[PDB]
Structures are given as C-alpha cells and as structure tokens.
Ligand binder design. Structure first.
Ligand SMILES: CC[C@H](C)CN(C[C@@H](O)[C@H](Cc1ccccc1)NC(=O)O[C@H]1CO[C@H]2OCC[C@H]21)S(=O)(=O)c1ccc2ncsc2c1
Lengths: 99, 99
C-alpha cells in the first residue's frame, strides 16, 4: 500500500499466532514489541531511545507478518511505549519513504 | 525522491539559518530538534519514548526546509540525541510510506 502520515501508520501484525497493532517506525533501527511471550532462545540486550536506555530480550529469526507481508528477523521485547516495527523488518517488506 | 531504509533516513534540513541532518521519522508524531536557541514564544512540554520522557520547548509556526521542500509548523526543542522530522511536517513535504 501507500500510507500517508496524517494519522499514525498503525498496522496489524501477526506474530507467534497472535494479532497485534504496531507502528511503522522509520526512525527505529530495530523492532521493539511490548512485553509478551515468544518461544525459543533469547539474549539480554540494552537499547537507547529518546528518553534513555532500557533492557530488552532479543529474539532472533522470528517470523512476523506485517500488513500481509512476510518478514523473519530480530524482535526486541521490552518496555517500549508502543509496538514499533523498525528498519530491520521494514526493509524486508520492501518499505520505502517517498516524497 | 525515494528513500530506502537500509540505513537511517537522514536528510538535510534548514531551520533558522542552520543546516542540520534529521531523520524522516514516521514513528514521531511531532518534530523534535536538538538543543538550539530559537527566537520567539514557546510552551513547555514533555514527550515520551523508549527510556522515558524528555523535557522540550514547543515553538509554533517555525519555517523549516527539508531537502528543498518548504514546511512550517510546530518544532519541539530539547535534549534529543538526534534531530527528528515528525508527521506534522512529513505530511507537508508530501511524504508517504510505500510497500
Ligand atoms: C513512541 C513511538 C516511538 C518510540 C517515538 N520515538 C520516535 C522513534 O522513531 C525513535 C527516534 C529516535 C532515534 C534515535 C534516537 C532516539 C530516538 N526511535 C527509537 O526509539 O528507536 C529505537 C528502536 O531502534 C533503535 O534505533 C534508534 C533508537 C532505537 S521518539 O523519538 O521517542 C518520539 C519522537 C517524536 C514524538 N512526538 C511526540 S511523542 C514523540 C516521541
């Protein structure tokens, strides 16, 4: 699709068999989801945003369907204010900025 | 232009008479610029993201040029680590997400 920006670019994603709402976030390097359970191994990591640093759980090679487009990649789980889809997965679904 | 997301979508902006590099950020409701001493009235505000909140100064009707496209609107000034062009101005320069 083409998505304008008068409203937040929220989309439905499917991950671990669950539907969630997430924000397409070109300013995010990484994909960060609010607390949830995901299967398999994870690694403790830290990431920084506008307000400082948080601790997250890093899950690798996780499938995630974003507005019907398939990605498989790294998902960070932790105290983000909202679910954000970052550039690591935006690139996988072929997302560009255009003006 | 078309900006892919392999790297951070940094572009040149001009505000006041300073040229700066800023992220075209679909995840940002508002535009947030690194500390700079702008003239005019402003209101205090707190904006939240990963890590918590930062205190910013809200300036209204500030002209900014973003890769040659003119925009004018609200700019938040505070201790952000990166200059952020948010949706308030992204719509003004005709910016869409496409996949
Ligand atoms: C609430 C939704 C997100 C988290 C909001 N953030 C914009 C976001 O694009 C931010 C923009 C950003 C970029 C770089 C540093 C700080 C902020 N990126 C970010 O935190 O990304 C993190 C995940 O990937 C990592 O890569 C970059 C930092 C990490 S923000 O910077 O905190 C932000 C910006 C404008 C704004 N206007 C009103 S509230 C508000 C909050």
């Amino acid at each position: 699709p083409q998505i304008t920006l008068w409203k937040r670019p929220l989309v439905t994603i499917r991950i671990g068999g669950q539907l969630k709402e997430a924000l397409l976030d070109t300013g995010a390097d990484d994909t960060v989801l609010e607390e949830m359970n995901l299967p398999g191994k994870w690694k403790p990591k830290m990431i920084g945003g506008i307000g400082g640093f948080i601790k997250v759980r890093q899950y690798d090679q996780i499938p995630i369907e974003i507005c019907g487009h398939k990605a498989i990649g790294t998902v960070l789980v932790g105290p983000t204010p909202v679910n954000i889809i970052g550039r690591n997965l935006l690139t996988q679904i072929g997302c560009t900025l255009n003006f």
